Amino acid sequence: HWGYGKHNGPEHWHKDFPIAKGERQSPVDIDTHTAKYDPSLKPLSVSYDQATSLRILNNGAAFNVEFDDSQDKAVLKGGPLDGTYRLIQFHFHWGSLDGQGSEHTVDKKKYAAELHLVHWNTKYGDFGKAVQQPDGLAVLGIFLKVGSAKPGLQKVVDVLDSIKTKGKSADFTNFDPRGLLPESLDYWTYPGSLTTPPLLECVTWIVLKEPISVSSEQVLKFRKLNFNGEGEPEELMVDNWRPAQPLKNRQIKASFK
């Protein structure tokens, strides 16, 4: 019964999920002046040309666009990663106001939202096994700022009315996640966790430096979603983000000078 309210939000999660106070929790603040350029990192390869989206689901915490991951149709390779990581889903975290909503921060700056493209390491055979491994997932994080509209987001925005409440899903075929990427793949990377319960410490984070711009109308449509199920008191799905957690004994590496 975890959530994002005062009574069940991030400050409470550690009681059911003690790993919340673990050594590699996410998100973190990215201090750009202490992250170090790593010339050892190989180029990042985002290969999404054969992606097969299936469905979109309101799970009561966010909405997930879900992909067919039964073959290497959309994969992430390179950068800090060894081997091949398959796209399974993406989701966002966002705010009630344009000045908050992201999970990662950059020199303490909060963006309006943050996209998480979730990929699992194919050496572990499926997602459920991958999340039990320290290198099981690679999550590509992309910041959203409010400005110009993002055409590649509009198909997502326009289906949200059909999944307003928790447990609702809809068909969502033929969506191209390449339309959600910025021009540059410059990134920061560090080892961390899921930012929601169960908070598993299985993620190589790859957070892009360049935000995408989305329009005020696009983000407003995210804010009309509901945390509740149909036939329950309405609580708007906003501020579904966890604040920054202690970096502890981790280093953030940059792919760029």
DSSP letter, residue 183: S
- Rounded Cα gap, residues 193 and 18, in angstroms: 13
Considering the complex, state which of residue 196 and residue 255 has its C-beta at the smaller distance from ligand TH7. Answer: 196
Assess 138 for contact with ligand D2S (CB under 6 A): no
Hey, which residues between 141 and 200 contact ligand D2S (CB under 6 A)?
Answer: none
Sign of the alpha-carbon dihedral angle for 63, 187, 13, 145: negative
Identify the residue among 104, 116, 168, 221 touching ligand TH7 (CB under 6 A).
116
**Total residues contacting ligand D2S (rule CB under 6 A)?**
9
Instruction: Name beta bridge partners: 91.
Output: 116
The two beta strands, 85-94 and 75-78, are antiparallel
> Stretches 3-11, 142-150, 179-187, 195-203: which one binds ligand TH7 (CB under 6 A)?
195-203
Assess 58 for contact with ligand TH7 (CB under 6 A): no
Assess 58 for contact with ligand D2S (CB under 6 A): no
> Stretches 16-24, 35-43, 174-182, 194-202: which one binds ligand TH7 (CB under 6 A)?
194-202
Write out 78-120 in H/E/C secondary structure: ECCCCCCEEEEEEEEEECCCCCCCCCCEECCECCCEEEEEEEE
Hey, which residues between 16 and 55 contact ligand D2S (CB under 6 A)?
Answer: 54
Hey, which residues between 139 and 178 contact ligand TH7 (CB under 6 A)?
Answer: 139
Q: Please give the angle made by the CA atoms of 66, 72 and 76, to the nearest 5 degrees.
A: 80
Distances in whole angstroms, Cα of residue 94 to Cα of each of 99, 187, 218: 10, 21, 12
Binding residues for ligand TH7, per CB under 6 A?
116, 118, 139, 194-196, 203
Binding residues for ligand D2S, per CB under 6 A?
54, 57, 64, 66-67, 69, 88-89, 127
